[PDB]
Design a binder for these strands. Sequence first.
RNA 1: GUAGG
Lengths: 435, 226, 233, 72, 77, 48, 242
Amino acid sequence: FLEHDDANRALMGANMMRQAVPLIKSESPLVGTGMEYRSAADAGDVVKAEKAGVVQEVSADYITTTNDDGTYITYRLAKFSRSNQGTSVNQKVIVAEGDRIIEGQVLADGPATENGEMALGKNLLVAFMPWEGHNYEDAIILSQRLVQDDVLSSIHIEEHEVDARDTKLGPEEITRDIPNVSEEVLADLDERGIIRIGAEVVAGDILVGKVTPKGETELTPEERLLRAIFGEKAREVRDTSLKVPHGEIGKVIGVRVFDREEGDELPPGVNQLVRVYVAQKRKITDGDKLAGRHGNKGVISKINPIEDMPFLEDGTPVDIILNPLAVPSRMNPGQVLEIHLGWLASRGWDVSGLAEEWAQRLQVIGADKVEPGTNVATPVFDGAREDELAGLLQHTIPNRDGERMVLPSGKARLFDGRSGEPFPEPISVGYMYIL
Amino acid sequence: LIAQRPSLTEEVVDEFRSRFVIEPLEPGFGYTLGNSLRRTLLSSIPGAAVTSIRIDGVLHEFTTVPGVKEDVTDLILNIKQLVVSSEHDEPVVMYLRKQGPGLVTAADIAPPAGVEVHNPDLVLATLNGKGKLEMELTVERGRGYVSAVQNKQVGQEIGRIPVDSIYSPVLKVTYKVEATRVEQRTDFDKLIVDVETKQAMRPRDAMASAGKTLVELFGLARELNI
Amino acid sequence: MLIAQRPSLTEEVVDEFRSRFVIEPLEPGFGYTLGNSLRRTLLSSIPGAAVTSIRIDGVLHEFTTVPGVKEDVTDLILNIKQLVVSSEHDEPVVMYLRKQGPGLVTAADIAPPAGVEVHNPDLVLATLNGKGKLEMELTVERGRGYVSAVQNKQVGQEIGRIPVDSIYSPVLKVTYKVEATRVEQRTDFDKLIVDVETKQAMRPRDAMASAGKTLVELFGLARELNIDAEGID
Amino acid sequence: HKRRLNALGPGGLSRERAGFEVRDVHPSHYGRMCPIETPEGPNIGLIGSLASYGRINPFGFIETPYRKVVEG
Amino acid sequence: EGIINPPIDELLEATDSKYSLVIYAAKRARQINAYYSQLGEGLLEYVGPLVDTHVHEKPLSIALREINAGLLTSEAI
Amino acid sequence: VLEEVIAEHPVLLNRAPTLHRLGIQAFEPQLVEGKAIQIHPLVCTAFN
Amino acid sequence: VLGLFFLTTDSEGRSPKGEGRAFGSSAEAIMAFDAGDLTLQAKIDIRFPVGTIPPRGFEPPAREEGEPEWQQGDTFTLKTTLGRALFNELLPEDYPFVDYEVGKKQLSEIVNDLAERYPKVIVAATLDNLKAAGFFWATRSGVTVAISDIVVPDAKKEIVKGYEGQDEKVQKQYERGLITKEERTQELIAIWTKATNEVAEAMNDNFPKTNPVSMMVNSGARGNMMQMRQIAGMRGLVSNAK
RNA sequence: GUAGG
Ligand SMILES: [Mg+2]
């Protein structure tokens, strides 16, 4: 629905469509342009097969295919390897075991991908109405259900390393014998002074133990006396071990080591290099930026429990609130079309023998009988006309009790979660993609 | 002027959904009554859920188990919505073991006595002919939501991993009001509260517990006065 | 399971009729249930008595003017509904007021029948010019909550009688606000501050005790489903 | 980021060199550049993505496919 | 229990300015903070808090309390 | 201890453009979970 | 400010049920409001307890009596809405009653008055109360946006085709060379300036005052007239490069 | 360099 959008906000959306982070589980948008499939396919993140045969083995680590000719090819799926910006490049598997394959057919989705189609976020049930100022100046309110079901949760893999270098005084050493330290600090480390795999870390945790070769130590009078009283030996070797930088958290997922004397080559001086992967699962929390396709972007300001959501007639809560004051001034009414079409897509429609102009247009287009949840396509400049939206809305399948739950106006009855009184007038509700 | 005390009646629409009607309610009460009932039922309700698991040959949730197309994290998401009922207040241990090619299921899981899964048809993952799944589960009981971050207590057992869990087995609640046939200006409203819940527990006992909680709170409010 | 801290209702008095009630921190997300429910039942469910209709001597329903009185009829309706009456007959009763001469006719000056007490005699009802002439009879009926004035054919039965709004609630208004508190290094706790404005007849805390008992009954009605236990204290 | 046309660079237009005229859209943009999208910062419009069907002339111009029309 | 608890207008009319009030209250705050940080010398020039004080307190709050009380006086050199 | 010490100690909030003197504004601190400053909606328009 | 404007609104904002009645006190008015018989936007009579300063314009008028009266600070009835009462109650007691719609400009005026005449602490408390009530009533207002909310004028198509009709006749009298291209451009831009002005006025006439976009633009909340013109009416003339 | 202000 770009045609109904001010260019300024379309520019904002297009610039904000290159920054969506993938999530644990990707889902294709319910409403969106029909070109997304090609955009996903041409990008190299997806893994497609070069032959048309029958898959022989389907495993997360690898997928084996055998063409009728006889060539066997095993695609290795990258798993949880750091990207350029530090997001997982996890890759799923879609094809079954015995299913026939065609050349170029998608075998495994990439990040932010689903069934070979682009999926840069998820789709939320959403309603337009102010709410106690917790959506003032276009701040956002989202239900705790997103905190509950990892609907918006993203992996983050950080990698940082340390180097053993032969300085003028001597060589640096990696070891579990760090000097001038407690015992428990070096608890989970390895034999050679490396953190094990799986050991969670916090700020100050020791990842790899490194010690300076030596240094000219003129021990001070006060320190001299202190050592004499406690009978401890200050040794020229000095601690230079790696520590987590302040304000961090994560589980170690992989560790790599390269060594000079070993067959691996290193730059001059550096004797050993160690890289550590620390990974976390950041859940959607206060302060996380968030934005719709049309450019409505805000910082989450509060996450109420599932009850305080202004819930709807059948008890479905709303998963996000939005400040309506935006959409007039920003001159970007595409999103109201989008939300209505999303509600339409969630609840299927049946149109047969209606003899209406819009009904005739769908029948000739063929999009007449639609089951609930099946996706839809609205090309950028040949999208759905408002008349089509109105007719389809008037002919939505009854979700429950044989009643259509949204009024023909596109507004429905909201029951305040906290007060319980039904809201004085209906409110607009639908399903919009969010990133 | 007329005095009429509330009267509750029940009806069942599905094996796990029921509608409960209270007609004598004062005007402009059924809404607040239904709201408090709904919120309390969702907020608090005893329940059981898996709380932390262990996988042989795996040291973190990020890696993958050979033999499954599903990575470990996919298994986390599969189990988080697994629904269980546990009678024991203290943690219990459950085991999932599967070999050969085929689907792994909740039914396949080894149930300890007094701990019962309630969604056997749920599929958790699939194994190849070469695959092997071995899994330890911890079944704890609680209420509401508990994230894995506060659910971690063992640091030495790196094999163990926490999982955020959901206890409340109620799915959704919806209340409606009407007008009573009684001839008067007040026009007493008729509240009807429909509750649908997961397979763990019947809605009747769920709202029995909710009433227990709320009546406790208001007994606290009243008795402490006068 | 057990609530980390048990709540404990407490009082803060600023006037014999105005009061504030505070709830010691509570399970998060519960504050709005309790406070809203309390608000509704305390405003409405508690019973009481109020006037129901009024009849001035020698006037018609369309004839809004009343001779011999400086004030009009409408302000008299406001003043009489402002009056609080405590009755228990459970059926309509009639109170009379027959006064003459110039001066001021007040609630003190009213002569009530048996079984009915007027709590506030201080209120001035009318100011008379010249001869008083005042003769007025009004109907009181116990009721529940608030009822809008309705036409019961009393005007048809006698042209003088007219309907009037009645306030059965012994309370006037309640304003409940929820705020956040920090306990055991956790901020997930909601204190309730409920300010009750009540008339002189009833003491507010007694009314809220009655309201709590009523809700306790209405929610013990749920125990009939089954017996279940929840962590508490 | 594959298909961007970065006008900033050596032997070419520089950030300080920018003017009103270069940044704005021109009637030849149709099919040769998406006039909608560009970084919002000081380099407004100087960077732009290629059009959807744009193909590259061997000399270095950008061609656009057009359907043929005859006698209506 | 907050910054605004002493209203400003009384202090302003007391000191007949805004900036003079700031420097004067700050001088008093410094004096009292020096007093609490004596830790034993007991210099006669230093003076304790004229108004009652909490177990833990910010000195400048007590300075402002004194000024609002109006008991403490100023005079330029 | 931190919750004890912060009260009655001003903090200057301040935005980057700082066009006019309403850029720098003193406030009382108050702890809150999450990782974001909170702010009082009335003063927001002074900062722009 | 949308909430406050929704609150201090004249009639017709809804079906004014329960209008034309008198109430003893604002408390019993709120009781009726909860009862649902009355609507917040409904002209009624209300009393006021003593100490309620009356409107500045209400100072000359007073109640009818043969004895001296001082209604500047005693009980007085007044014709107004529950909303205006609530809005006064937010304001401090000593402030005279305000009975006119607040919108945006008037709110700034009264805030200036308060900041001028009153101490700072009262100003802060009053602003805080205003904020709380404003958010609450914005929640209750029900402002939204929807496809039926923004209604295109019915007349537009007709008028524009007529205007378009004009256009092509000029083009015809240009294809014979009877007019220069420059003169054609000037007369076309004039014609379409007229057309867009007329369509803007038409749309301005069509929309009712109850729909949310009108409520928020008129309140001074957000937006301005031409945004509505180009979301509902045609954009009109724009500018090419240079 | 490139994103946000
Ligand atoms: Mg900004």
